[PDB]
Design a protein around this ligand. Structure first.
Ligand SMILES: *C/C=C(C)/C=C/C=C(C)/C=C/C1=C(C)CCCC1(C)C
Ligand SMILES: CCCCCCCCCCCCCCCCCCCC
Ligand SMILES: CCCCCCCCCCCCCCCCCCCC
Ligand SMILES: CCCCCCCCCCCCCCCCCCCC
Ligand SMILES: CCCCCCCCCCCCCCCCCCCC
Ligand SMILES: CCCCCCCCCCCCCCCCCCCC
Ligand SMILES: CCCCCCCCCCCCCCCCCCCC
Ligand SMILES: CCCCCCCCCCCCCCCCCCCC
Ligand SMILES: CCCCCCCCCCCCCCCCCCCC
Ligand SMILES: CCCCCCCCCCCCCCCCCCCC
Ligand SMILES: CCCCCCCCCCCCCCCCCCCC
Ligand SMILES: CCCCCCCCCCCCCCCCCCCC
Ligand SMILES: CCCCCCCCCCCCCCCCCCCC
Ligand SMILES: CCCCCCCCCCCCCCCCCCCC
Ligand code: NA
Length: 270
């Protein structure tokens, strides 16, 4: 009965361990992640004057997301290198008992804080038509909170009870679907009052949103996408999961923010 290896990262680290390549690749991608959030923070601060006052709350929410993402992705990166240590005998990296072990806390806290602000910020750039600001905001905030909480409950059972990990994943996915449905309505209403140039940016925001947000549940399932005896049920699934989370983070926070800023500028021409 394995005791030291809470999450799939710790499990692999405690059993098979990590190759020099898997350990170094993961450390570099997590470092890239926090480095891009810091670059983003400076970009959103320095370009805030490029949009009319009425849109600047969006630029502010982008900057605030970047502060929390930078700090918590920095903490996640340090957590990776501190949790696994090289054994000369076998020549791999194993879970270090003298460490605090890999912790999903940093990532899930990041999501809890930033999901509501990413959903909120579009409501300061587009105008609704038949929907109420307060109704859309409340739906986004409730569904967003329940999605991340149900997901967090799931992640605990990942190694101890796979079945529960999936059922909680499914409940989380139900809230996710409601978020996609609301955002699609917001984007369609936002297109009504604006130039074709603005409508085209909103079409690109929808595709970026749909893809980047679906990467999260994809990374959540990554180790189990080739079955329990599968090639992903390994350090390869851990590498893939951390890579996909980093791509999702850069896309859902930084690229999303840039596109909204670009939309605000096109509304700052007609
Ligand atoms: C910058 C961080 C963002 C936008 C985080 C978004 C996270 C999700 C959309 C997560 C959704 C999940 C599911 C739909 C099912 C599995 C568990 C989650 C929480 C990963
Ligand atoms: C306006 C164009 C600004 C480009 C900013 C590029 C930053 C890339 C990160 C490297 C520091
Ligand atoms: C017209 C659109 C202008 C694009 C500017 C985008 C600037 C984003 C900079 C933040 C992320 C860059 C990555 C740097 C890594 C170091
Ligand atoms: C108008 C300001 C020019 C873009 C700032 C670029 C910041 C990227 C960080 C590196
Ligand atoms: C565009 C005016 C900005 C008002 C801020 C409302 C959001 C604050 C969240 C609490
Ligand atoms: C303005 C939207 C709310 C985001 C602030 C923090 C979110 C609460 C979770 C802690
Ligand atoms: C629903 C989201 C719950 C996330 C809370 C976890 C916070 C833990 C912070 C890092 C762990 C350090 C030990
Ligand atoms: C919604 C999930 C229902 C159960 C899936 C069956 C997987 C069990 C394998 C152990
Ligand atoms: C989409 C509705 C799904 C119903 C299940 C709700 C379960 C609540 C989760 C417990 C909260 C902690
Ligand atoms: C034409 C504008 C397209 C915006 C999406 C950019 C995303 C880069 C791909 C990663
Ligand atoms: C059409 C351009 C839309 C942006 C492309 C999607 C990027 C997904 C992130 C990975
Ligand atoms: C359905 C819209 C885009 C989905 C992108 C694919 C994400 C699933 C798993 C990612 C690895
Ligand atoms: C809501 C569930 C989305 C996860 C899709 C990712 C799986 C990729 C194909 C299997
Ligand atoms: C004409 C419209 C084009 C705007 C596209 C915006 C691109 C966002 C730039 C950030 C991409 C981050 C990639 C850095 C990783 C190295
Ligand atoms: Na180490």
């Amino acid at each position: 009965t394995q005791e030291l290896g809470a999450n799939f990262e710790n499990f692999i680290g405690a059993t098979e361990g990590f190759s020099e390549i898997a350990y170094q690749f993961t450390s570099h991608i997590l470092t890239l992640g926090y480095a891009v959030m810091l670059a983003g923070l400076l970009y959103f601060i320095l370009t805030i004057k490029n949009v009319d006052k009425k849109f600047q709350m969006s630029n502010i929410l982008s900057a605030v997301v970047m502060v929390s993402a930078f700090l918590l992705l920095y903490a996640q990166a340090q957590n990776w290198t501190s949790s696994f240590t090289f054994n000369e005998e076998v020549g791999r990296y194993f879970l270090d008992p003298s460490g605090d072990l890999f912790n999903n806390g940093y990532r899930y806290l990041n999501w809890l804080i930033n999901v509501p602000m990413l959903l909120f910020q579009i409501l300061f750039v587009v105008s609704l038509t038949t929907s109420k600001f307060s109704s859309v905001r409340n739906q986004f905030w409730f569904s967003g909170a329940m999605m991340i909480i149900t997901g967090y409950i799931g992640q605990f059972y990942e190694v101890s009870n796979l079945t529960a990990f999936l059922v909680w994943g499914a409940i989380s996915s139900a809230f996710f679907f409601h978020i996609l449905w609301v955002m699609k309505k917001v984007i369609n209403e936002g297109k009504e009052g604006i130039s074709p140039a603005g409508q085209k940016i909103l079409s690109n925001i929808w595709i970026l949103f749909l893809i980047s947000w679906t990467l999260y549940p994809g990374a959540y399932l990554m180790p189990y996408l080739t079955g329990v005896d599968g090639f992903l049920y390994s350090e390869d699934g851990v590498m893939a999961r951390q890579l996909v989370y980093t791509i999702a983070d850069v896309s859902s926070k930084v690229i999303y923010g840039v596109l909204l800023g670009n939309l605000a500028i096109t509304l700052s021409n007609k």
